[PDB]
Structure formats: structure tokens, C-alpha cells
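Troubleshooting entry. The earlier prediction with C2E gave an output that would not parse, so I re-checked the input for stray whitespace and re-submitted. Clean input:
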Amino acid sequence: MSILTRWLLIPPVNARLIGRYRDYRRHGASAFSATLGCFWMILAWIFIPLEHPRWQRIRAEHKNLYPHINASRPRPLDPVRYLIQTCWLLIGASHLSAGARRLILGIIVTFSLILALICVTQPFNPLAQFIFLMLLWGVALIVRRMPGRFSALMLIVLSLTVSCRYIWWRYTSTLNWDDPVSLVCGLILLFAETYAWIVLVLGYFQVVWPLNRQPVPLPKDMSLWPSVDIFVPTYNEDLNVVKNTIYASLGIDWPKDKLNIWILDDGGREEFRQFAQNVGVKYIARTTHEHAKAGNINNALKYAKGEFVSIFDCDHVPTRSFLQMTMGWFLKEKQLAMMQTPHHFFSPDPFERNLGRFRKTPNEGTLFYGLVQDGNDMWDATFFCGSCAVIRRKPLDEIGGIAVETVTEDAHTSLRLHRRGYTSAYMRIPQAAGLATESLSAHIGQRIRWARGMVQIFRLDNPLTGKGLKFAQRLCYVNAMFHFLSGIPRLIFLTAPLAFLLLHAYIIYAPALMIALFVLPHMIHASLTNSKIQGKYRHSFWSEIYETVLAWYIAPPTLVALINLVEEEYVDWVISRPYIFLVLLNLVGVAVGIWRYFYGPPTEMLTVVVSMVWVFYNLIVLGGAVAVSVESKQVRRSHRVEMTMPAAIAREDGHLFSCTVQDFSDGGLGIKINGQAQILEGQKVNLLLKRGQQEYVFPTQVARVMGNEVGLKLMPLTTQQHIDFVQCTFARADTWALWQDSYPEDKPLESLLDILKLGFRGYRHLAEFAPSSVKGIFRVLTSLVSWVVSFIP
Amino acid sequence: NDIVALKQAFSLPDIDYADISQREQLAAALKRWPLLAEFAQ
Amino acid sequence: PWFERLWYALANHPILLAVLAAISVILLAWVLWRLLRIISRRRLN
Amino acid sequence: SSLWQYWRGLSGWNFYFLVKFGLLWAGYLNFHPLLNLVFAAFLLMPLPRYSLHRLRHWIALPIGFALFWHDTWLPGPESIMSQGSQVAGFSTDYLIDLVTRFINWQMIGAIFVLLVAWLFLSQWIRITVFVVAILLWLNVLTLA
Amino acid sequence: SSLWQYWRGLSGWNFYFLVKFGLLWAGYLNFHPLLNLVFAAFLLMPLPRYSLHRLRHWIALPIGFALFWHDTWLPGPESIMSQGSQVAGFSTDYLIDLVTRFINWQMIGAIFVLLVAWLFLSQWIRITVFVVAILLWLNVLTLA
Ligand SMILES: Nc1nc2c(ncn2[C@@H]2O[C@@H]3COP(=O)(O)O[C@H]4[C@@H](O)[C@H](n5cnc6c(=O)[nH]c(N)nc65)O[C@@H]4COP(=O)(O)O[C@H]3[C@H]2O)c(=O)[nH]1
Ligand SMILES: Nc1nc2c(ncn2[C@@H]2O[C@@H]3COP(=O)(O)O[C@H]4[C@@H](O)[C@H](n5cnc6c(=O)[nH]c(N)nc65)O[C@@H]4COP(=O)(O)O[C@H]3[C@H]2O)c(=O)[nH]1
């Protein structure tokens, strides 16, 4: 029958069709798909001039710029996608006297507050409110592009005016006093939002003015420098994690006559005793194990004799500049009794490891140790955070040592020191790096312990109502304690629209337009103000993910306390149960809402849309939370730190070649050689590292050669070689500061896109494994529709 | 050059760094080799 | 009714209220900036 | 073998057909679908040489001009040739005023907008096949 | 050329067309869809050289100014030229009162917020396609 085709169709087109059909048959594509593709091709080339060289040049780089379209994979409704993408592109764009000064301040402040009260309590019609919204939002946007602290204050005040307006409107004209069911839940949501507003106001106060304390130079004479004792308390950590801490301590740039390093062991392990004997540091193994780490430190204080005590965790390695950058203030302020240093984690956190964003997004704790403690510094409320700190022993002996009551002993002892009149200080430069939690369960547990301790301090010591303590200190401490009571409001927020969608209950009795015109400015201004203030500390919309991960596990213990090596990828079902339950509830709500959009009253058309967008936001948040709960592969014994240093390699025949170190770990290095000079996968190599102008040699064995990249494994080193290696790789006083300074800034829209992709990735992750089999089908359907829509944006 | 990197990164123009490790190594070297001790002092 | 009178005065004036709010924000920011500078200088000494 | 490059389309004459169709839609043209379809077939009919194609275009330019003139309601050129003496006998200022009054700027603006839209849509809309389809539809309407 | 990459868009004239559309919606305009469409086609006419593009913009600026003046309900140039001497000879108080009554702060605020929205859109959503579509819709509605 090929003769008929040859006669009817010109042979070039016939050959093209036959070849395309054969290619799609070999790839499994349907013959009907090939026929439809050819029909579209011919109808286009006759109804669309594809001969234009402009479109040919666009097609030349179309694959690189738009790799989401495949010419060899036809799909139903392809021309609709082409038209939609084309429409998106065409749419898209390609001094004075005291009394007079006080009176002037009084009049200015009262006038400004009267104007703010008028702005807050002015009823509007929707158009007037919208104009007000656009104007104030534009003012915020303009002030955003203005570096400094005055702009931060302006944004704080503007946000406070907007939030006070929102709360005033909610408390005046949203509570519907008609129903007994549309009242209790509405007031519950109102109380949740009032708590959130209070937390926001106290946080704005806390970081209103970071102090930016600077190190004070030490005296030139080395005989005036004070004696420092370093404590390293260990209970069950392996020696491989404390060795680097001890080696970095032995290399601290402090006079060895005035530096004693102690290893505290609550396990009575003989390996630690022998290690202490070999390296020359002290050792204490108490017979009675009471009060845990606080008791260990107290027993150590019973023997140590030094002016200052510096507490280090097992995994935290100090830089050599730590004592020189810290001790200056203790000799300047006689009242000082505590100094704090940031906590940095070179190990990838569970979020960073699982979600694949390690060096892109900032760490969870760099907002606290980067901005919050600096804010607490101004009000003299910088509390002990466990490690990377120095305490003067004379004040610490008066208070009876480290507090032993709560599980968070550091905050308690800092609170006692502040209540006895002593001050505290904070230094911003990261001078010690530790290991992050190895799993989501560990993060949940440590946060639970911290929250339990903070609630215990709130119930027992009660910073609000105690003894001599400044009001700013009270506010800072109560804000830190309230931060851990946010689980219940988060649960309310995640389960609020399900009320109306499931059981008709008007939580907010206002038209959807007015809700959009009042709630939205609050959120927009809060996001902008935080993005300016906590700029290189936390990306936008990420705090909700952490909050929702913690909420279900922090709310029960906090409430009770108020009353009284990944071999294979897997999903932590036990940890992820609450997220899956909330996803099921929200999606059954969205099914009911889809029903109500048609079979419900027509007047409730925008309200259902508002509830549905709320449910969609909830689902994105919970999907990100689930995405956290899948553990990525981890077979590296030691974690690697990406640092670029020039180096050199020495062979046994005496040839030296230059190389660039790209990453280092406890027992290896990774280097890059321009051309793969001379190295094989078992040869011994001497590695030359420079610390300033001094060069150090370390024996290595080659483990992997993959072209330019070479992996090296460290040979058994002596103690001095260990110290030198730590001083050349880990305890460098430039790695952590530049690490924190290299964090990208906060882009709210890009952050939203990343979080949406993360939620989609989490849904796809759960589309593979399923605890309750039934959920499998639903998850697969959701992922299917979601990627179909993504292909049709 | 770590201290130089810190100074270039975050202010710190008046904190003179006292490298006590280098001084202790130099003193031990002067004690160990009498030639260096003779020429230095 | 004085609050009613004040509201009716600016019932449909969003531009004027935006100007007043910006003025209040700038002035309160200046006062807070002065106070926080004073407290910061006293804090570092 | 690039034998397909002998059937290129009617790029350059698509504006002609579009203007004629617009005039027909506006009622200012006496349309002959059969003659237009014959002209389109002649234009789309290939010639062995590119120089022969240029010669065909040069021959069809007077043919296209004559067809456009005759499709309009203007009187035949023979009457103009006969009465040129009488026209010259009339005052020239009155003739200038009359020709300035006769020109309709609305149609000129519409023609300019159509030319711009044809130069732009020659990216997403191949005008040759659409013109052929519209001409076939008009021929079918006039036949049945 | 092969590409004709000269359809750069209306660029700043999107705000001009948006202002015209808003004034027409307010009801203060004697809109001319044909003249607006011709002006838009003139602005979107592809030109090879950038110097010709700049010259076209410079020439179109007073043309657009005159078209905007014509499409309004303000009196024509004859009245202005006849009453300029009287306006100059009038007292300052009457001129100040006339200026105050002529300026509407609501109109100024609407124009400013429209300009800000146009800036935001032109940063994210281009406006040439929307302006052309709106002009075509208005022309079709008026002609039909
Ligand atoms: N035999 C051997 N080969 C090594 C080693 N380190 C790197 N490679 C090789 O280099 C590739 C690039 O890995 P990367 O740059 O570390 O970037 C890695 C890393 O970011 C991540 N990754 C893979 N496995 C692990 C793991 O066990 N732990 C961690 N933390 N990340 C891992 O995935 C990326 C891609 O890794 P691959 O697809 O496996 O491809 C790896 C692998 O072929 C090593 O210690 N031993
Ligand atoms: N900084 C650095 N160190 C390197 C590199 N290559 C090897 N090492 C060091 O050499 C040790 C042995 O690695 P291996 O023999 O390839 O044997 C490796 C390899 O089989 C596997 N592995 C670890 N990470 C990766 C990875 O990213 N990708 C793959 N494909 N395998 C990995 O786990 C084994 C244990 O590796 P580790 O526990 O990391 O212990 C590693 C590490 O200390 C490198 O490119 N960079």
C-alpha cells in the first residue's frame, strides 16, 4: 500500500512521516500521537509562518532556555500549553536645655501617637482602604531600599501601625455575636492572632537595635592577662568527636601558663582518660552522676582554680582567636560575668540535609545567634546558651554554681547572674563550629528539652514578677519563653478554615474583600520588615515550616510544664504522623469546599475561595514539613566543609605539584589538580598546607581519582600533627565568619517558589511509600495532577 | 592570613593579634639551637 | 460623637491619612533612633 | 533536493488580498471570487527559475494593478483617455480641491493598521493559506 | 532583514494609553479609536536603525500630545489664541481661582497610582499586547 502513499504524498513528506512513525514506535509512543503531531505541524506551517528566521533563532536556544518542552514526547493538549506559555511570555516582561528638650520630645511624641491612633481607628470604604494600602505599601517598599537602622525603625513603626489597625478591626467588627458555634471558635482564632501579634511586637522590641558589640583590645603586657579554664563535659560521645575540640583547645593563642584544658567524663570511660594523659590535658570522672552536665561542671569547678571558666560542648571546636576576641571586655567591665559566642554548625542540619539546600538557605539557628542575641545585648539579657561562653568564677561561686533545677541550666544560671546585678555581653564573630543534629528526631528532642526548660523557668523563677531586674530584661526573657508556646496558635491556624468548610461557622463575619484588605497588609508589612531586619539570617516564609514541624511535639510538653549514618533513604513515619493527619483533614476540607462552591449558596462564593486558599497554604506548609521527614543517604563518617585553599602535593619520587583544597573533613581532604599531574588511587602523598606563612606537611593516601578531582585519606597522625591539621582546617578564624557572610539575602518571591517546590517534592516523596496503603492512591493522584498542572503553567 | 581575613571581613582595625603559639615555638627553637640563640641575642 | 465627627472628617481621604501616617512614622522613628543611640552609647561604656 | 522551495507562498501579495477582503467586508468593492482564485493559483504556481519567478512578479504587477483598479467602481481608463482634453479644459484648482476632498483618511489609516498587523502576524499567522481558504469559501458561496 | 527584531514594544507609551483609557472610562474624553489605533501602529512600526527609532519617538511625542489634546473636551486652539491677551490682562486672583478649580486632587492621585502600577507591571507584566488588544476591541465595538 506504499505506492498509494507515494502517489498521494510527495516522497519527502512521506519519508518524514514514516521516519517519525518508526521513531515513535521504537520509543513506545502511540501512532495516533504521531498522526496528531504531524497534523499540528502541517496545520501550523500553513497557518503560522515557521519559516521566519526570527523564530528559528529563538528555537535554536529554545531547548537550553526552556528545557521543559520535549519535541519527542507528545502529550494531549500541547497547543493549549504552547498558547498559554506564549500568553505568559507576551504578558510577562523580558545640645539644648533639659526642660525645653523634654517638652519638645513630649509634643512630638503625643502628636505622632495621635496621628497613629487616627490612622488605626479610621473606618473606611473598600476603595479608600485599598488606596491606603497601596500608599503605605509603597512607602514601605521605598524605605526598604535604604540601608541603615533608621529605615529599620521606620519599617517597625509602620508595621506596628498596620498590625494595630488589623487587631482593632478584628476586635471591633469581625466578632459575630449571633451563634454559639460561630462564637467560641471565632474567639479562639482571635486569641491566637492576638498572641501572634504580641509575639511580633515583643520580637520587634527585642531586635529593635542590635548593639554590634566589638572586641576590646587586650593589654599589651602578657602578665595582666587572666587565667582561663576550659571545660569539655562528655557523657556518651565517641572520642572521635571530642578529639578535634581538644586539639583546637591545645592550639588556642593564649599563654599556656594561663590556660588549663579539662575533660569531664560522666561515663568513666578509660579511652578518654588515656587520651587526656597522652595529650596532656586534665581529666575528671566523678563517682556520683547527679544533676547531669550542670553537676559535672560544678564538680569540675570544685577542683579548677582559674579566674575564668569557658564551657565548650564536645562537638564545638574553638578558633585560636577565641580568647583574644573575648577576654577584652572582662578586663574593661568589672561587673561583667558572662560572655556569649555564636553557635555555628558545619554539619548539615536535618532541614539542610534532607531538603537539599545546605549552603543556599541560612541555618535554622543563625537568626538567633546572628540577630536575637545581639538585640538582647542592648537590654542586658544575653543568656547562656550552653557552649561557646565564658563565666567569671567569682560571680559564679556566689550563685552556688550552675543552676541544677531546670533542664536548661545555662539560661537559669544567666538569669540568676542578671538578678544579682551582673551584666552580660555578646560577640558576633563565629569562633566555634559544631555538629548539627543527625536526624529530624534529634532536632525535635532537643527543641523539646529547650522548651521544657524555658517553661520551667517561666513557672519557677517568673522573670515578670521576681526581684531586682530591669524591665527590658523581663520582656526579653518572657519573649524567649513565649517563643516555645506557639504550637497551639499554629495548630489553630492550620485547622481554622476546616471549621467553616466542614461545619458552617463564620469565624470572621466580614466580606472576603474586607478580610483581604485588612489581613493582607499585616502579613505583607511583617514580611517586608523581617526581610529587612533579619536579612542574611532567615529567608521569608521559612519560620512557619520550623514552627509547624515543632508545634505538635512542643505544645504537649510545654503545656504540661506550665501546669507542673543513613544507610538507606527512608521516611520517618512516627515523626511524620501529625503532618499526614493534618494533610488528610485539610484535603477532606478542600473536597467539601469544592462541593460547596457549587452546591452551596451562591453568595458564599468569595468566602469559599478564601477558605480554599487558606487550605492551600496550609497544605504547602505541611508538605514542606513532610519533605523534612525523609532522611537522605549519609555514608560519610566525617562531615566535609567546603573551603578553598591553595596547597601542594608531594610524591615519593620528589615531585611537587600545586593543588586547590576544596573540602576537608576529620579524616580526609578533597583537592582539584589542573590536568591531573601525577597521582594514582593507592599512592601515598604528602599534603602541604599553609597557615599564614608557615607550611605544614601531612601524610595522605589517595582514595579516588576522577580527573581533576582527587580524594585523599589522612594517615595516622601524631598529636602535634593533629594539632597542626586542626589549626589549618577546622580552627581557622576565617571559615565560619565568611560562611555566614556568604549566605544569600532574602528574596520573598524566590523563597515562595522554593517552598512550593519543596512541598511538591515532599508530596512526590510520599507518592512512593505509604504507612496506610489507602493513602497511596490519593497521594499518587495528587502528584499526577500536580505535575500535569506544572507542565501546563 | 586568617586574622587578615577577619579584619577585612568585619572591621576590627585596632585589635592587635598576639600569636602566642609562634612566640612559644620561637622561644623553644632558641633554647634548642645555640646558634640561633647566639645570633638573636 | 466626637470620634464620629473625626471619622466623618476623613471618611473618604486615603491620601491625607497616608500622609499623616508617614509623618507619624518618621517622627516616632526619629525619637526612637535618638533614644536608642543614647542607650547604646551608655551600654558600651 | 530543495524542491519545496518552489512553493513558497504569497508573501508580498497577502497584503493585497487582505486589503481586498477588508474592502469587500466594508462594501466598497465589487468582488469576483473566481478571478481572485485564478490569480492566487497563478501566483502560487511555481516556475522553474528564480529569474523566472522575478519575471512573473514583474508581469503580475501591472496585472495586479489592473485587477485592483477594475474591482473598484472607478470608471474605465478609456473614458479618461477620451475626456482628458475636457479635464484639461477645466480649472486645475477645482480639480485639486476635488481630489483632496475625495481621499478618505479613515480607509488609509485602516490600510496602514492592516499592513502593520500583517507584518506582525507574519510571525504567528501565515497569511497565504488563510487567504486561499477564505477565497475558496467565497467561491463556494458564489457557486452554491 | 531575516529577523526584523524591531518590535520592541510601546515602552513608555503604555502609560500614555492607560491614562487615555482611564480618562475615557471617567467620561471626560471624546475618544477617537481610529486615531489611537493609527498612533499605536505608528509607535509599533519596526525600524531597522536605532537612530530612526529615536527620531520616530521624537516626532511622535508632539503628535501624541496634540492627539491627547484633541481627544479631550478642552477648548480648541482658536479660543486660546483669541483669549490669551485677556487672560494676561486679567487679575491674579481670578487666574488663581481658575487654576484651583481646574486641578482635581483625586485625578492626580489616580494618575500617580496608575503610574506606579504601570511601573510595577512593566517590571513584571509587559503592557503592549494588552494596549493593542484593548484598542482593537474599542475599534471593533465602535465600528460595529
Ligand atoms: N567513592 C567516593 N566518591 C566520592 C566521594 N565524594 C565524592 N565522590 C564522587 O564525587 C561525586 C560528587 O559528589 P559531591 O561533589 O560530594 O556531591 C555529592 C554530595 O553532595 C551528595 N552525596 C552523595 N552521597 C552522600 C553521602 O553519603 N553523604 C552526603 N553528606 N552527601 C552525599 O550527592 C552529591 C553527588 O554524589 P554522587 O552522585 O555519589 O557523585 C559523587 C561521587 O561520584 C567519596 O568520599 N567517595
Ligand atoms: N574531603 C574528602 N574526603 C574524601 C574524598 N574521597 C575520599 N575521602 C576520604 O577518604 C575516605 C574513604 O573514602 P572512600 O574510600 O572513597 O570510601 C567512601 C565511599 O565509598 C563512600 N562515600 C562517602 N561519601 C560519598 C559520596 O559523596 N558519594 C559516593 N558515591 N560514595 C561516598 O563512603 C566511604 C567512606 O567515605 P568517608 O566516610 O567520607 O571517608 C572518606 C574520606 O575521609 C573526597 O573527595 N573528599
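This one parsed fine. Residues A 635-638, 640, 663-665, 667-670, 703-704, 711, 713 surround C2E (ligand 2) (CB under 6 Å).
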